[PDB]
Amino acid sequence: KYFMSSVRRMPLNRAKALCSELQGTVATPRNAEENRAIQNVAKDVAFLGITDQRTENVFEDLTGNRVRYTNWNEGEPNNVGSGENCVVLLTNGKWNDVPCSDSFLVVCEFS
Amino acid sequence: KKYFMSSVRRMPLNRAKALCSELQGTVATPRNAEENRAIQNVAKDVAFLGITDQRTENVFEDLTGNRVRYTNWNEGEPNNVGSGENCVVLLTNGKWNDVPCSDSFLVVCEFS
Ligand SMILES: CO[C@@H]1O[C@@H](C)[C@@H](O)[C@@H](O)[C@@H]1O
Ligand SMILES: CO[C@@H]1O[C@@H](C)[C@@H](O)[C@@H](O)[C@@H]1O
Ligand SMILES: [Ca+2]
């Protein structure tokens, strides 16, 4: 896998469109090594290709595959307010669930 | 190493540049036959290369203004037809054709 970060921030729908445009997908770390690699390419908080939009508290990648490895920041995922169904990788590498409509950088993953 | 990825949609060169730069890459510029073939492998149809003679006609440079060395022009190219063709695309046979920068084609981005 090759990981590339965007320079501008955008909501998940636009982030998915960007990675998909170059025939990739929003980055989904499958282990601690991939998590670090994505963290490194991301210069700020960035979206990951994981959501619980289909079933609340059931996190899966953008292709419907349930994720096994997770790295939630303490207290996460908390689905606060009216709900947080998207996921971002914080600058310390831990994850936070956030509203999919919010804007963050995006890290795309290619094979 | 250099990695190449092709777009799904077609767009003019300035948009192609913006797409590749969005992910901190550039429009693919083959420096030799191996790279030319690597780009061929990812481009399913005619696609833009990061080369233009916009500065001086018939002097081809990459997008950073660096004069290119390796070229693989299709027979009869570059012909600068009509009002001008100052951008370059990789044809489906791997050879190059100069085309109007305002025309739309797939784009192959390069990252390293
Ligand atoms: C208290 O909730 C935390 O802080 C909020 C400002 C949001 O970033 C939320 O995702 C996070 O879990
Ligand atoms: C005759 O010129 C050739 O055919 C035209 C349709 C254009 O594609 C032009 O770039 C090419 O050199
Ligand atoms: Ca949720």
Ligand SMILES: [Ca+2]
């Ligand atoms: Ca949260």
Ligand SMILES: [Ca+2]
């Ligand atoms: Ca020309």
Ligand SMILES: [Ca+2]
């Ligand atoms: Ca031509």
Ligand SMILES: [Cl-]
């Ligand atoms: Cl949400």
